[PDB]
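Notebook B, p. 112. Complex prediction, attempt 2.
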Amino acid sequence: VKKAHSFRRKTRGKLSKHPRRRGLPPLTRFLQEFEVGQKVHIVIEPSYHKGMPDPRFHGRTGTVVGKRGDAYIVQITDGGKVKTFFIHPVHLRPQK
Amino acid sequence: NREAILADWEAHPMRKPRIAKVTINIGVGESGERLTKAETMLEQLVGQKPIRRRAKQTNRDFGIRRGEPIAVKVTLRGEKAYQMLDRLLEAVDRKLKASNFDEHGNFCFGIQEEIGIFGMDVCVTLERPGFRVAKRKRQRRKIPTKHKLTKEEGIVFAMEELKAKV
Amino acid sequence: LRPAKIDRDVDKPAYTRREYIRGAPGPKITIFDMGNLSAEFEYEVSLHAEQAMQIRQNALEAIRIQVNRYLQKNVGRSNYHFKIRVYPFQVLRENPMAYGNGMRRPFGKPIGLAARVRKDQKILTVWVNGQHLKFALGAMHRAKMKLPYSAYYRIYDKEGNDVTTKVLSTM
Amino acid sequence: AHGPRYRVPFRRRREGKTNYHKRLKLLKSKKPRLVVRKTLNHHIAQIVVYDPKGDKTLVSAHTMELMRGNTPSAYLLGLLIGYKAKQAGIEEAILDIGLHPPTRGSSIFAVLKGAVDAGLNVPHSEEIYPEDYRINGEHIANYAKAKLPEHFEEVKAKIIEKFE
RNA sequence: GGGUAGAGCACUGAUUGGGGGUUUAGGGGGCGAAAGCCUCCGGCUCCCUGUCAAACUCCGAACCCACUGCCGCCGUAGAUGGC
RNA sequence: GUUACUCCAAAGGGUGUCCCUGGCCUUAGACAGCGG
RNA sequence: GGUGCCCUAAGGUCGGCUCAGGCGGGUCAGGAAUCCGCCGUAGAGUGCAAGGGCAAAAGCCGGCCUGACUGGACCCGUAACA
RNA sequence: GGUACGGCGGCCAUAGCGGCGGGGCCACACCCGGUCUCGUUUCGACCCCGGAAGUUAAGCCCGCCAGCGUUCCCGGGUGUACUGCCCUCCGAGAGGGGGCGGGAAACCGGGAACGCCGCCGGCCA
C-alpha cells in the first residue's frame, strides 16, 4: 500500500526526547540572535509547534539570509534547488 | 509517651501538637436528591454555613446522578472545635481506644443518632504549628520526620486534652 | 505433521508478539522442572547446541517424557534435578493454499510454536551426584537423538568450572 | 529522584523562586524590568537587564534605606526607585511580579504608582492602584481607634527635596 | 544529525520454579451452634532462579548525510550555470 | 578422487589407518595358562 | 489499525489548583462514591485511531469574550532529488 | 577588610533524595488577629491585610555521611560480540574463514562526586 508523505510520517524517534529533558528548554535558545550569512544547524525542538520546518530537513546546515517577524529566513540546497524556510530560533543552533 | 511529649516540651514548645481541624461528615449518606434538613441539623449545632458534596461514578446506594447532593460536611477550626468536642467526647465512650489512631495520630468517631435523623462521622486531624510550608505557595517543601507526628503523642495529647485512654 | 526441516533454520525475522498476531496457539508444554528442586547436587550435566537452531515444542515434550521416565526408572525422584531452560516464543505459520487461489495473498496462518537457540547455548540440564553419571550420559544421548541438529554435552562443578575430561577419564 | 527516567526540575523551581513561563514572556520584550519583592516586614525593588550569563542589576532600594512593610512604605520605595532610575540613564521599564498574585489594591501596585508619580514611564491602567486614603494611613489610623499621615507627609517632602 | 546490528530488562508487554509475607475480593470446605475469629487450597508484595520481542529500550556501533577549512582532480584552449 | 562458481546426498555409525592430549597399573603388569 | 465527523464550546485569554493507584483511619455484600492523613516523575486526563507533546501545564475549577473577522504579500508539502 | 544575612539569575541530578550534628544585632521564617483592600460554590484551612507577645522546634544558613539514585576516570571482560572492502578460501547446504581498516553493551574491581559561576544589596566596624 503506497502511503503519501505527511508532516509526521516516520517521526516516532526523530521527534522524541530523552525522558530527562521532558519539558521547556532553557531560555537562551528562544532568545538567540544570528547575523546575515551565519551558518546554522536545523535541530527541531519537539515541544514548540510554532515556526517548525518539515522534519525532512532535520539535521541539515543552512545559511541565514534575513528576518521576518521573530523568525529567521534560512536557505538550504536540496540537490540542485534552493529552498527557503522561515524558522524560529528555538529550532536552530549555530555552527561553531 | 509522656516521656516523649514532656521531654520535647522541655526542649521547646513548638513541638507541642494541637488540632489542625475537626471535620464532621455525613458519610453513610441519606440525601439522595432531596434537601433533607441534615443541613440545618449540622448548621444549628455547629454555628455557620454548611456545604454539600457532589457524587461520582454510577453506583447503587447513593450518588448516581453525578453532581447531585449526596452528603454534607463541615470543617471547623479555632475554638469551636474544642467546644464541640467538649460534649461529643463526653457523649461517647471514655478511655479513648488505640485503634482509633492511625499511623500518624488523627482519629475518628462513627456515632449515629420532627426530623432528628442523622448518622455522623467525626474526625480530628492534628499537627504542630510549622506545617504550613507544605501548603504555602512560595518556597514550598515537605516536613521531615523529626517535626512529624506520631501515634502515642496523639494518645497523650488526647488524654491530657479531655479524656482517659485504654 | 509437516517435516522439521521447514522450521529448522533461523533466517526469518522474530515473530514473538501476541498483541498483534491473530489466532496464535497456546503451548503444549507446561512442565519445565522435574525431580528434586532443593537438594544441592554436585555435578551439572548440560547440553549445548552445535549451531543455531529452532526446536519444536513437540520435540521438547518428547524429550521431556523420555528422559524423565528413564531417570525415574533408574535414579529415583529423590535425585536428578532435571530442567529445560528454553521456552517456545516463536510462532510458525503456514500458507492456506492446499478451489484454491495458490500464491495469491500468501501470509501464513499460525500453526505452532518453537524455541530459538544460538550456537553454544544451553538447552537442558541434569543435576546429579557421582554415582549416576552413567544414567545422566544416557539421558544426554536419548535427548541428542530427538533434535533437528547436533549437540554436545559438557559437565560442570560447583563454581561452574569444566571438569568434563577428568570425570570422563575416571569411571 | 528515583531512577534513570526521573527529570530533576530546574534549581530555582525546586527552591520555589522563579516562574520560567512568565520569565520568557517578559524577556520577549527588550525593555528592562522593574522587580519588586515583598516580605513579612520589608519591601525590596530593583531594575534589571538581561545577559545570558546572568541578569545584571543597575539600581535597588530598601525600606531600610528609607527608615535610615505596608502600603505607605511601598509608595515611598517607589518614589525612591523612580527618582534613582531617571539618573542612571533609563527612561522605560516594565513591571515584574514573580509568584505574587495580582490583587486590586496591594502595596506592589503601590510601588508601581509611586514610581509612576516619580516620573518613570511604566505602561499600566489605573484600576489596580490602592486608594489614596490607604496610601495615606487613614486605614491604619482609623484601625487604631477601637506613622501618622503627618510624619508620612514629612518623609514625602524630605524625599522630594532630596530628589527634586 | 541518526536509533539499524549487537546487547539488555530501566518502561509496554510476555515467561520456569523455589523462599519470606498481607492474608484476602473470592468456590470446596473442615474443630465451622453456620459470611465469624484457625488453618486450607487462591490473588497481590520483596529475595533468589531460568527464559524473550518486526510493531519494547536504561544503552549503543560499523556506516551514511549536511556544512567549514585543507590535500587531490577538473577549469580563461572557458567552470558552476542559463537560453 | 582427478569439479573455484554456474552445474556435486544427510542423521547416525566404523580395534579401517595416520596424529594430539589426560589419567591408571609396571619388573612382574594387561591375555592364556601349571596349580583353588 | 482508523477517518468520510463533532463542538458556541471541546474555540480565545486571564487567574487559581494538581492527577492514577496504594496504605493507614472511619461507612460496607464486594463497596461501587462520598470524610481524614501519608506516599506517590505522571504509572492519569486530553472530543474521537495510532504515534508523538504536556505538571506553579497543553490537564481540573472558575471569570470575561468571539482573531472560527476584512484587504493583501511571501514560502513549504501532496508530487525528495526532478 | 568582616559577617553562620538577603534579592535577581546562568550552567540544569558531579547539583537529586535520605540522614547527622550546630546558629539567630541586623535579617528569613514560624507566630497573633481579621475591622479595612481581597476571599473562602462551608471553613481568614490556603491567598490578601494590620503587627509583634513569643520561639530557633520546622524552613534558611555552616559543616559532615558514599546509604538509594545520576555522572566521570582507570583496569579487566577483550580487541570478545558486531561491522565496511577484496578473495579460483572452507563447507552438501545452512553458514563460516583469511587480509586491510573500525569497534561495543551487560558484569566485575578500584577511584572522584553530598554543586560550580555572574550581578546588586543591607548590618558592621
